[model samples]
Target: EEGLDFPEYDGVDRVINVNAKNYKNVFKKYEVLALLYHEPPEDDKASQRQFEMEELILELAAQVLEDKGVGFGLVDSEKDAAVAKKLGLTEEDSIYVFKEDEVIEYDGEFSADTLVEFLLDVLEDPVELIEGERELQAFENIEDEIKLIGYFKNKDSEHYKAFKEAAEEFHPYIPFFATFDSKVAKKLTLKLNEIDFYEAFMEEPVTIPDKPNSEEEIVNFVEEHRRSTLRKLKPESMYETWEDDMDGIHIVAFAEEADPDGYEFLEILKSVAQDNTDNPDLSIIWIDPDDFPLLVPYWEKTFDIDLSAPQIGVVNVTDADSVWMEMDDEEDLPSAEELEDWLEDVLEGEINT
Candidate 1:
């Protein structure tokens, strides 16, 4: 009895220690796979962080999605260099979560909740992982119609979840999407913290409700705001619509509605907006002639400009008593690069009066 081999069983309810020989068969069976590739601490002096991170993920699989049947495992890449190479292991002490062949590389601080969020996201059937503004722009560009994008500080926020659910419900009509506010804005990108949800069509933006109550309201808002390329900013609704406290450079264009060249000029403004996505502190807004009559007096008193249509202006929202840099005329329009330089100065308080 001492030397006898005990009969074994398969399908254990815990994280399995995997190796090169059995990893293929073990990982391929599950739809979602999380692999932690880490080297053992030198001389058996392992950092508590390493073990803690691993354990946190392991428990997530067991408690969160264990019954749902997700796969979680660890491979000592140092011990099995061949396995590490196969998985494209470029760095040691890294975590990778995969769905089928698509993978999400974890590059955040070590925390249980964060790791759990990563695991939960990877397990979803359809995942939207917007790592930067470039990807976000690409997502909007690819869609045929307008997109309703929700930007939030956390993926699990009420705004994000509500948007996702709405996306599913309204899938037959318009496209729904979302991204992390902090991640989307790096060196320069959209400053989206002020609004929880926004509609993007033809590169023009209109903020939606922070918390939409019903599917009808969500759909109606999308349809109402999805206009042609022009973003109609009116004086009566400007303050209510635009976040006054938002810290950024506002690129406002006032264009003549009846002029044949007006649309072309607006297109140029949009092109500049696309090119300067790397700067998070810039907002491109348009005031068409439809709203010009009402905005003229406001513009005259506030900015002290004659307030002619077909002109551009710059306002640094950060400065409390900042004066507007209203373009003198169509000829006063600056090149995109020149505008960017002007924005840098405005951002640095160099242009403040």
Candidate 2:
């Protein structure tokens, strides 16, 4: 109708028709809908712990597909979302799946808390009904592929010797920082560099050298020496070790893959986790950058916890660095007093920076 004569397409293109429904109505199409859940095993008696919805979905989808005599498996939530986007699902059309046979269907302003409240209000079973241990036995029993090779700092100090021996005995023979949060580890490295610990401790830390064969050899030798210095800094404070009866040679499972030959190492680490993580109060979390989206949401929902926030430091390697406590076995985690004393020293600036 304006001055710009926009042409109208053919009036009635072959009597087209359309069918549409409210988002809520569409969400309610299914009956006896299943909610995915994963729970930890409790008491060593095979009691289901808590069910994480996403993990549950993963496990159930596999089993369901198997039962249906189909080789195809269900896609994960993220993939589903990607497909939904291609199909034109918009924010306003989003209907949060709060529970089985129920969903939060509304067009309103929302925050994380508000969304969570709406979810809680609409679920069939109390949220408590869906929590437990995820089966991990398969992760165990795989052949050890990676070894914890230590470039040790053997300077005849008793503490350093203990760390060296422990490295050979219990450490995973690999060199990769777990997750990537290297704050504490980096600070420790810088401090060591200031002390000439790299030269004094080992040879040099290993890495790919862009030098010729002759020069590369020298670079590798120095790298090995540097690594030895780092190795000596193991098993934080002995006082912290004494607090919880922590093992003397605490080996942190910080790194995963330094090279392609790492899956074997992952298997062994998984096995170690299964055996040692039986305590309900204690938990072992494995986060892979590649797998983050697949697993994180379920954890956030089931634990009523979120790791994405900056405050919690999702990729913290303090534990893996053996900064808090380190030992060869499960028995050496530090006691309350030792841990408290060490923490106090750090807080009061007793450590030599």
Candidate 3:
């Protein structure tokens, strides 16, 4: 052997080899498992180099968290193609942490220190005031629930106290937490002496007003800025926001200014919204095609509807039950009154199609 050897470290065999056969049972033993995947290279030197780098990170991460009983493993993608495919991999090398069925990929810089830190954070229980960006990442990794994070500083100040109390009050609704650490705020690209509220999936960040003293104020602030029934539906905004606002009904329409028909449709939507000012159950919203041009492609792909000028759809935001005005047959297109009647039908658990 011409010294073409992969050095196995002194650490325990915590980095187990998982194949297609044993993966199901293998993942069950640890509370958290960091799964690594790499395609073995044909060139000996390149292969050896990659192996060493991956093994070092995995071994060091396992060694650091051994006391906490975290598991680490490598999957040879060629050998365990089924397992790789099951985890949704189509490429070469990848690293992801799995807890039960949830998977969070490691998207940060690669190193033994970063890997160990990632494992340690994964093993620890979540709290209100996160340590830093790592903890914030851990908070965000759980994709199912809505996440509300308050970025703050100066723990002794009134602002911090308000944040803590707000977190406690609203903790029951979703993941409500605060961070007083500067590094965490920096990671989030926020300045000090300001409270920033974030909905994990929303691109636009909502900043909380200064020095909110009372718990009620904090709670009201969160609730007030919480997902609105009417959404702007930008590419940055999550589609899940529509599903989240199921408590009320939504009337969504799309139009642009240059097109006369589209302009008239938007005008009709605004008129309906004005008329229903007192109607608490309905939310009338408009999407400007000029702003989110992607809406056209999304409509074509998702709803199988091609649009050139104007389009209107009444969507029962709760169930996504929808009625669209016929674009081709303008004569057969429903009036605003017909659309309103359909909305009434949806509210009463009926479809007016």
Candidate 4:
């Protein structure tokens, strides 16, 4: 043992437990890493759920950027209060990035990919250069997230410069690549220049046909395409989906995962969301009743239904009108088909007020 000994990080291969004794060496090693410092979860189920969610996010974010010397450091703020003090932090939950001579707060989006690209920009180029055939193939094979690649004549070209600016604008939230080599361009069937977004489910990438003369327009173009028909309703994402599809009535399902019947209802919601993906007028949302306990009474009164069980309803955010598909036979649950039918008829005005 030396004057300053570093205890080994425990459990997670990807996420490291940064204690007071070991943190100095870790921060000194990696160019950047997301340090998640939080207190222990309370006995409440909802609090435990939040903690679990953070742990999963930390692990996935760590695995994605570990190759780039990005580390995921976890600090038990309460248990290791001394470490928190030594790091010049207080008792709380927050994310920070530690670079040599720099300790930056992560005030960006809380998603895994968003954090990855943000950290990557600090250590590497956010707008990566894809020159190799293998690199192009790797971009093609990406399935989980939407992929973007730009084919520009050269780095000095006008459009390429704008593309570069736009990539920087989206660096925190999205990752995209650019190519100046004609060999890769020919393989992509590019006629010199274009911007394309590839989706996992689709066989081909959709050419945005960018009118991205300005960086702002390019930013909007990207945001306009990165949408899904279904999303988990949370504090972070609620407002976005509510206004996204004005023509369609928004569907909200409230459930507690702890309940036995709640699990069955979520499966129905998943199936419904999958089948209705192509339906632009349909936006499905899953909200945990436990997540917002304060709104429990409001939802109960608004929908005129019990919140203790799984409930699904449609809301007109504009008029503030809503109708719940409250089953008369409360003992039985509705299948995906029945749920879809309700959605169809409600939007069709078949269901009377």
lDDT of 2 by residue, 36-77 (tens): 111223365333322223333334332433332211112223
Ordered from best to worst lDDT, the candidate numbers read 4, 3, 1, 2
For model 4, name the residue pairs that clash.
none
Q: Give the per-residue lDDT of model 3 (tens digit) for 1-353.
A: 68876644565566788888788887777888888878865578877887887787778778777777788888887887888888776545767777654566655445666566666655553336678567787865643234556556566767667666666444333456667777787776666545565542333456666545366776787776565323344322233345444354456667665677776765555455545534545554556667555456976566555566566666665555566655554454456676677667655664322
Per-residue lDDT of model 4, residues 93-144, tens digit only: 7787766555655554466766666676667555778888788888777543
Query: Who wins the TM-score comparison?
Result: 4
Model 3, residue 3: displacement in angstroms?
36
The number of clashing residue pairs in each candidate reads: 4, 44, 0, 0
For residue 263, model 1's alpha carbon misses the true position, in angstroms, by 34
Q: Point out where model 3 deviates above 4 Å.
A: 1-12, 126-147, 150-353
lDDT of 1 by residue, 124-217 (tens): 5442557666877777564224456555567766655655555544332345656675655442244553222333324445555544334456
Local distance difference test values of all predictions, in order? 0.56, 0.28, 0.62, 0.71
On lDDT, the stronger of 2 and 3 is: 3
lDDT of 3 at 235: 28
- Which whole-number lDDT from 0 to 100 does residue 122 have in model 4? 67
Candidate 4 — worst ten consecutive residues by lDDT sum? 232-241
